[PDB]
Symmetry: C3
Subunit: 424 residues, 3 copies
C-alpha cells in the first residue's frame, strides 16, 4: 500500500519536533492492514513525538486499531512486536499493511494477529509502536520504553481517550524487552498511563548477558551483531568507538546487517555461530569505554546496572523457557527475583519442557487469559517469584481493613532483628 | 479352584490359532475370585487370541469382571498387575481366583482390589490381562502391550460392548510398564480402542536403565535377573545368547527364578545385591549382539531407542517417587519430559518424600479421582510435564472459535526464527 | 504499668508449688495492654503452675485476652512470641503492658499484635505464654513446650472453658521453635488439649545446627550464645560445665548477654560474628559431655536426636524462608520430610525470594487465613511435605467409605514387595 519507509516522508522527523509534546500526534493517515480487515476495525498509522536515548526530541510511527464495537470504560492493549532487526523497512508499521512485498512480514503474522484480534474482539483499543523508531535501534531499552509509552499516549490523544484509560501490555522475545523497558520507564516517563498489567515472556533483561549467550556459540549468533548494531545506532559515541576498530570482514557484516530487507528471518540464520569479537580489531572491547558503561545502563538486572532499576507495582505476568536457547533464562529469573525482593507483583511461570519457539505459544494463552482479568482489575493474588502460580489470600479478606492497613504499614519499619521489613 | 495353570488345559495356545482375529475369544470359563465376590460382580477368565514379540500368533488369558449395574454409556477399566515374575503360576488370572494355595497371591490383594472395586462400584467393566502371557515374559513391552490391548478388545467382544466404549488404564510399578507399553502401541495396534485416559506411576520406562539401577547394588537385585529372564523368554535369540554363556552358578539362578512359585515376593527378597554379570561368562555381554539391539528396542526413552517412540495424545496421569529405590526416577522423568515436547497430554506428579511402596498408595487415590474426570471427558487441562498440576486455561475459552483454530494451526509451521512450532 | 518483673513479686514460684496441678492457675491480676485497649478485650496476667526441664515443679506467667463478643463454641488462639532472650524483663507478659519503659518492647508490636487482633475479632480466646519461663531459658524446647501447653490449660481453667475447646497456635522464629516443641510434646504432656492446628514458620528445629549456622559467621551471632545461655540456664550441669572454662572475655559476654535490658534487639545486633568457642576454653567442649547429650535431646530433627521424636498428626501449616540467614532452612526441611514420611500432616510452604524478616510477613496472612479454616475443622487436604499446596482428594469420597477403610487397613501391613505400607 505504502512505500518502503526509507523512501516514505512519513518516516521523517519534522523540524518543529520540539513544539510537540511527548506522545503527541504529529499527523495521521489511514492504513489497510490484514489485522484490521479481519476484525472489521479501522487501522491508522500515527506519526507521534517521543524522546530518544539522549533526550533529543524525536518521532516514531505506530499503527493503531479501532474496534468497531468498543469496550466501556475504554481499555487499551499494547502489543510489542519482536522486530529484532536493525533496518527501517523491518519496522512493525510497514509490515502490518495488507500486502506481500514487505520483507519483515513474518514478524507480524505468526502469533501477533491472534493477540491483536483478541484485544479487538474483547472491545479493546490496540496499538503497536515501532518501538525501535526511525533510528531502528534494537535492544536499546530507553528508546524502546519511551516510544512504546508515548505510542499509548498517542493512542489516547488521537481518539480523545479518557486520561484514566486502562492500559495492558503483551510482548515476547524482543517484544518483551520492549514491554519490559516500557514498564521500568513507565513510572517516571509516563505516570499519566494507568497500567493495569504487563504480560511478557522470554525477557532478555541484561543486554551483555544476551550477547555473550548467543555470541560465537549459537546458530542465532546473528542476534549478537544485530544487537551491537542497534546499540551503536542509539549510542552515537559507541558508533564512534566501533567504526575505527572494525576490520575488513567487520565492515561488510555491519553494512549487511543494517541494509534494506535484512529483517528477523535474515538476522536469525544469516550469521550462525559468528563471533562478533572476530569482526573487530580488539576483543577487549566490552571492557573499554564507552561500551562498558553503555551496557550497564542498558540492562534491567540490578546487580549489573549502573543505575537504580525501578520496581513497578502494577500486575505483571511473566514466563520464560527454562531451556531457552536464544534468550538466556538466568538473567530473566534474576530480574524477577530482584523485583520481587522489592515488592513486585510478578506472576512468574517457568516452562520446564520448553524451547524459545515452544514457549512463545505456551505463554500466549495463559498471558491473554491473565490480561483479561487485569482489565477487570481482578488478576489473581498469587505468590510473587514462584515458578508456579500459588494463590495467597487477601489481607482485607482475612484480617479485615484496620488490621490489613495496620499490617501493610509495617513495610519500611524494623523487625525485632534490626533488619528492616520489606514490601510484602 | 483350578489346577496350577502349567497343568491347566485352559492355558494353552490352540492349534487353530490363526483362524482367530486379534482380540477374539477362543473359550471362556467361570472364575470365582475374591474381587468378584467382594463387589457382587460375576467374573470369567477369557482365553483370547493375541500376537507376540515375533508377530507369531499366540494366546493369553485375562480375567474380567462384569458389574451388576453397569454404567451407560459403557466404560471399561483395565488394571495391569505387577506380576514382576517369570512363572506361569504367578500369572494374575490364577491368583485372582478365590483361594490361598497359589504362590503369586500378593500382587492382587494389596492395592489392586481397591482399584478394580472402585471401577466396579463406578459401574465400569473390569478386566486384567496376564500381560506377560503364557511365556510370562517380564519387562518385554511389546508382548505386554499387545496382550493388554487385545484384553480390552476381547472384553468388548465377550460382552458385545460398543466399539467406541470408553477405555481407561491403571498400573503401578511393573503394572505401569505393562500399561505404559499398551499406550505406545495403542496408536498402531489398537486405534479401534476409545482410550479415554491412562493413569500410571513408578514407570520403568527404560529396560537397561531400570536394570542398571537394581543390579549388584540393591537388595532387590532380583528384578535385574527376573528382567533378563523375561526378555530372553520373549526374544529367543537373546535366550540362545545367554544359555551357553551362563555358568553353573548362573544356570541355578535362572532355573530357580523361572521355577514354580518364584513370584514377586520370592524374587525381590531371594537375590540381594546379586551381580548378574557373575552368573554368566563375558562381562560385555550387554554391549554384544543381539542383546544390545533388543535393549535399544525395549526402551521408551527416545534418546536411547532404536525406533521412533509414539507420543499418544489422549489424557494421561503419571506419578513417581523422586526418592524411588526400585524403579529409577531418572528414566521415567526423561520419558515424560520427551513426550510433552512432542505434544503429549501427561499430567505429571513428582513425590518429594517418597518410597516405592509409599508412592504406590500416595498416587493411587488421586489417579482414580483423576480417571473419573477422564471418563466424563473432563480431565484437567494442566501444564504437561511439570512436577505439580497447574491448571492452564482453554483456547476455545480465551480466543473463541475462529481465533482458536487460527491459533491451533501454528503448530508445525515456522516462527520468525526459522525453527518450527511444536505441538503445544 | 507494673515494675521490672525481677522486682515484681508476681514473678515468683510459691513454696507449695507441688500442691498445684500442671496447668493450674496460681493467681491472676488485670493487665492494661496496648492490645487489650485496641480490641476492647479485658486482659489479665496469669501466674500458673507448670513443669520444667528436670521434672521439678515450677511456674510461669502468661497474658490472656478475653473477647467482648466471644465465639461459640469456645476456641483458643495461642500466639508464641519470639522472645529470643535470656532475661526476665524480656518476657512477653511485661512487654505486652501498655507502656514504653520495658526494653524488649519490640517483639510484641510488629506482627505479633496483628496475629492476636485477628484472633480476638474472630472471637477466639487469646493466650501468650512466657515460654522461656522464670529461668528464661532460650532454645530449650522442653521448658518452652510445657510452659506453652500449660499456658493453654491455665487459660481454660481461668475462664472455665470446656475441655474439648479448639486450640490453635502461631509462631515464627524463636516463637516457632517454642510453637514447635509444644506440638511434639502435645501428645505426651497434654492429651487433654484439643489441638486443631499449629501454624509456624522459620523453625530452628535443630539447636546444634542453628547454633553452628549463626556462630562466628553471621551478624546475629548473639543468638548462638543467647541460645547457649538459655540451655545452660535450663540444664544446670551444662552451667556447671561451662562456668570454670569461661575465659576473661567469656565471663563478660555471659554476664552481659543475661543482664537486664539485653533483649532481642540488644542480642541480635550486639554480638555480630562472635565465636562462642573463643569465649570458653575448650573448643572441643561442645563435642564433650554433657553438651553433646543435651544437644541430641535439643534437636527436633530425628536424624540427630537421641530419642524418638514425636510425629503429631493434627493439621500443621509450616513455612520457612528458603534463603533464610538466621534460622537455617535445611533443618526445618529435614524435620518436615521426616514427619511427613511418618504420616504427619504438614502443609509445607517454601518462600523462594526470602529473608528471615520477609518470610515473617509473607506467611502471616496465609497462616491466619489457614487457621481460620482449621478452627472450622476444614484445613485443606494438601500434599504433605511439598513446597507448594497440591489439593489431594478425600480417599473416602474417591474410593468409597468401605474401600477407604480397606486402604486405611493397608497401612502397617506388607506390600507385594515385602517392605511395609506406611501411614499415608
Ligand atoms: C585496535 O585495538 C587496540 C587495542 O587492542 C585499540 O587501542 C586501538 O584503538 C584499535 N585501533 C583501531 C582504531 O583500529
Ligand atoms: C564365553 O564368552 C566369550 C567372550 O567373552 C565367548 O567367546 C565364548 O564363546 C563364551 N563361551 C560360551 C558362549 O560357551
Ligand atoms: C579449661 O578447660 C579445662 C578442660 O576443658 C577445664 O577443666 C578447666 O576448668 C578450664 N579452665 C581453665 C582456664 O583452666
Amino acid at each position: 500500500q505504502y512505500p518502503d519507509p526509507n523512501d516514505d516522508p512519513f518516516y521523517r522527523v519534522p523540524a518543529n519536533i520540539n513544539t510537540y509534546a511527548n506522545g503527541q500526534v504529529i499527523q495521521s493517515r489511514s492504513a489497510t492492514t490484514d489485522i484490521g480487515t479481519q476484525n472489521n476495525a479501522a487501522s491508522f498509522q500515527l506519526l507521534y513525538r517521543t524522546t530518544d536515548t539522549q533526550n533529543n526530541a524525536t518521532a516514531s510511527v505506530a499503527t493503531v486499531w479501532i474496534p468497531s464495537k468498543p469496550a466501556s470504560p475504554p481499555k487499551i492493549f499494547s502489543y510489542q512486536v519482536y522486530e529484532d532487526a536493525t533496518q527501517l523497512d523491518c519496522a512493525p508499521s510497514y509490515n502490518y499493511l495488507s500486502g506481500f512485498d514487505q520483507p519483515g512480514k513474518g514478524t507480524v503474522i505468526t502469533d501477533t494477529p491472534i493477540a491483536i484480534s483478541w484485544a479487538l474482539q474483547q472491545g479493546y483499543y490496540a496499538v503497536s509502536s515501532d518501538h525501535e523508531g526511525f533510528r531502528s535501534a534494537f535492544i536499546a531499552g530507553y528508546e524502546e520504553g519511551m516510544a512504546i509509552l508515548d505510542g499509548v499516549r498517542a493512542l489516547k490523544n488521537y481518539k480523545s481517550l479518557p486520561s484514566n484509560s486502562a492500559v495492558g501490555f503483551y510482548g515476547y522475545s524482543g517484544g518483551a524487552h520492549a514491554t519490559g523497558w516500557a514498564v521500568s520507564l513507565s513510572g517516571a516517563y509516563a505516570s499519566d498511563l494507568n497500567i493495569i498489567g504487563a504480560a511478557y515472556g522470554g525477557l532478555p533483561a541484561s543486554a551483555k548477558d544476551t550477547f555473550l549467550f548467543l555470541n560465537a556459540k549459537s546458530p542465532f549468533a546473528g542476534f549478537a551483531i544485530a544487537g551491537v548494531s542497534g546499540l551503536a545506532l542509539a549510542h552515537p559515541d559507541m558508533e564512534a568507538f566501533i567504526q575505527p576498530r572494525l576490520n575488513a570482514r567487520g565492515r561488510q557484516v555491519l553494512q549487511q546487517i543494517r541494509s534494506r530487507g535484512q529483517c528477523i528471518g535474515q538476522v536469525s540464520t544469516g550469521y550462525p555461530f559468528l563471533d562478533t569479537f572476530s569482526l573487530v580489531n580488539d576483543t577487549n572491547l566490552l571492557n573499554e569505554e564507552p561500551i562498558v558503561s553503555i551496557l550497564k545502563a542498558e540492562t534491567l538486572v540490578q546487580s549489573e546496572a549502573g543505575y537504580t532499576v525501578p520496581v513497578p507495582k502494577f500486575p505483571r505476568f511473566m514466563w520464560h523457557a527454562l531451556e531457552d536457547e536464544i534468550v538466556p533464562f538466568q538473567p530473566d529469573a534474576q530480574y524477577v527475583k530482584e523485583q520481587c525482593s522489592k515488592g513486585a507483583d510478578i506472576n512468574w511461570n517457568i516452562y520446564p519442557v520448553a524451547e524459545h519457539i515452544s514457549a512463545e505459544l505456551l505463554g500466549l494463552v495463559p498471558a491473554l487469559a491473565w490480561l483479561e482479568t487485569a482489565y477487570a482489575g481482578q488478576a489473581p493474588r498469587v505468590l510473587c517469584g514462584v515458578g508456579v502460580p500459588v494463590p495467597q489470600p487477601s489481607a482485607f479478606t482475612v484480617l479485615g481493613d484496620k488490621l490489613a492497613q495496620q499490617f501493610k504499614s509495617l513495610a519500611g519499619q524494623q523487625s525485632a532483628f534490626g533488619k528492616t521489613f520489606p514490601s510484602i
